[PDB]
């Protein structure tokens, strides 16, 4: 279902220009503006915050997606433990970007936050496995990439909103 994101393998020019070329290729494929989203990140010495689609925020050091409430429910907990668990170091980079839809799918590319950051892309699926066919789409998008590495052998099944943990892997690339 929720396919994992991928690092921006394409790196031959300006990151902004690279994202622009990727979006131009996507438009050449043929899509429509489905809005713009973001992916936040806040580390606390290591609970890593997150936000995606979208009326719900998430934060987890190592858990199977314990988030089912809005940021307010979580931000209040953080503010309450201002000296107990508040270990907010230098603000972790957070990406953003528009999202388009070729056909019956969704695409989303990321952006840099401080400037020397990545601009990776993320895609998902609509089935419940089936990692083979979804790769073909990316074959039409770029060259060899997207190793995936999902939580295989679980279907704790279908990885519902657990892909944010995979998003943490993208945060590891720094």
């Amino acid at each position: 279902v929720t396919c994992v994101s991928q690092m921006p393998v394409a790196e031959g020019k300006s990151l902004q220009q690279t994202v622009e070329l990727l979006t131009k290729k996507l438009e050449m494929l043929g899509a429509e503006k489905q809005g713009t989203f973001c992916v936040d990140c806040e580390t606390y010495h290591g609970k890593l915050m997150y936000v995606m689609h979208y009326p719900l925020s998430c934060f987890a050091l190592f858990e199977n997606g314990p988030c089912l409430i809005a940021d307010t429910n979580f931000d209040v907990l953080m503010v309450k433990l201002k000296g107990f668990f508040q270990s907010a170091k230098a603000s972790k980079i957070e990406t953003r970007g528009t999202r388009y839809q070729y056909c019956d799918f969704l695409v989303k590319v990321g952006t840099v936050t401080m400037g020397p950051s990545a601009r990776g892309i993320s895609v998902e699926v609509e089935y419940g496995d089936c990692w083979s066919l979804l790769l073909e789409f990316l074959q039409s998008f770029l060259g060899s990439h997207a190793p995936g590495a999902p939580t295989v052998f679980g279907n704790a099944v279908y990885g519902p909103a657990d892909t944010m943990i995979q998003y943490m892997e993208l945060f590891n690339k720094i």
């Binding site: 858990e63 997606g65 314990p66 089912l68 409430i69 307010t72 429910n73 907990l77 309450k80 107990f84």
Partner: protein, 180 residues
């Protein structure tokens, strides 16, 4: 960002049916119902002798509904000529993922007793009643404690006076009291 009020009380055992009959026709449209809960009170402390409000008492009814805990502690000053009031919050969580993360964060339990009861939808407020049940670890007060729960943002807090009007309704064997 939000606060909650309470005018809790208690009543005798035999004197419930006559009571709840009146309580039904107070601010509820129709179709009175009930709920069986489950107490999952936790404990998160060890550095300042001041734990958090981890009383994750959630219903054990039909699945799908997610268990969670609410914030209720540190009664702040104010409430001039008013009843109990505390700046609080609420937090929903995934099914059993909350307990998972609590155990992974190094927390323990607090209670193992469940108190089912009845609910009744007031207007801007809500009222509940329950009774502790004596059960073992694998399974007590003999008194149905009732309460007037209402949560809202800062606003004007004038509705508390309206809450006092409900106190007028709970005349026979119900009153308000704090805890110390």
């Amino acid at each position: 960002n939000m606060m909650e009020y309470l005018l809790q009380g208690s009543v005798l055992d035999h004197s419930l049916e006559s009571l709840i009959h009146r309580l039904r026709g107070l601010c509820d449209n129709m179709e009175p119902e009930t709920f069986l809960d489950h107490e999952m009170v936790f404990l998160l402390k060890g550095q300042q002798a001041s734990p958090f409000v981890l009383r994750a008492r959630r219903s054990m009814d039909r699945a799908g509904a997610p268990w969670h805990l609410r914030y209720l502690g540190q009664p702040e000053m104010g409430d001039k000529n008013r009843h109990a009031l505390v700046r609080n919050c609420v937090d929903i969580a995934t099914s059993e993922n909350l307990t998972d993360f609590l155990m992974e964060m190094g927390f323990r339990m607090d209670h193992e007793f469940v108190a089912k009861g009845h609910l009744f939808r007031k207007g801007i407020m809500k009222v509940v009643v329950y009774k502790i049940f004596r059960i073992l670890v694998p399974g007590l007060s003999l008194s149905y404690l009732v309460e007037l729960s209402v949560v809202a943002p800062a606003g004007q807090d004038m509705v508390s006076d309206d809450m006092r009007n409900f106190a007028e309704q709970l005349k026979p064997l119900v009153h308000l009291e704090k805890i110390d």
